[PDB]
């Protein structure tokens, strides 16, 4: 079968992440794609805010994120690595949980699995993974700014 | 009779500049609006590709051009000044004439009247110096745009 390709074209999937699905082995393909869609959505809003938020950093962040985005679209991320990323993104989607997103990010940052906080150990981090982790931090700061300015 | 309030609402005017009208006294109001319309169109294409071309300079360029545009919309520019600006914008509309546009721009920035090259003196103010500087940004963007597609 070619389920992953069906998922990538499925227009009934939104960017909204349900925390209860984080960790589910069966819901992994779907969650992987949702993270891909939301990251694209965050970049879309930054692009709409270029005039007001670090325009000189956009293009580079976007480009550094392409490999991760492709991995998410193809569901090639490791279980615990997806769990940690989805956790960061989930909290980032929640009102007033910017500190929970940062806390989760720091866990992912030092090779530790991150699970959602208040709702519902080790992970391998190579040069490839380290690259997008660093970039994800820029999305976090953009969202913090976007929220405070709206 | 606010005709400037009429020309600005007319959708029968395009951005295309006819060089034979640059020094016309009767066509001043029309040419002035055309320059306004063309500059907006350039800022529009830059906007559409903001991430690809110096996004950090866009906002400042728009702000510096705001007062010029208002003046163009109201036909408030002195004859010699409109002539020079129109000349620069006219050549800019010609891809293979980017160098003639820059040459015309140099005259304008020096306070001299720029007449179409393919086909005496002026005075410069502060706020005026402000928009003359941003015009060069429109030129650099255009060169990049027509080169990257």
From Swiss-Prot, chain A:
Its main location: nucleus. Transmembrane segments: none annotated. The keyword Cell membrane does not apply. GO terms for biological process: generation of catalytic spliceosome for second transesterification step; mRNA splicing, via spliceosome; nuclear mRNA surveillance. Homodimer. Component of the U4/U6-U5 tri-snRNP complex composed of the U4, U6 and U5 snRNAs and at least PRP3, PRP4, PRP6, PRP8, PRP18, PRP31, PRP38, SNU13, SNU23, SNU66, SNU114, SPP381, SMB1, SMD1, SMD2, SMD3, SMX2, SMX3, LSM2, LSM3, LSM4, LSM5, LSM6, LSM7, LSM8, BRR2 and DIB1. Belongs to the PRP18 family. This is Pre-mRNA-splicing factor 18. The lineage of its organism: Eukaryota, Fungi, Dikarya, Ascomycota, Saccharomycotina. The gene is PRP18.
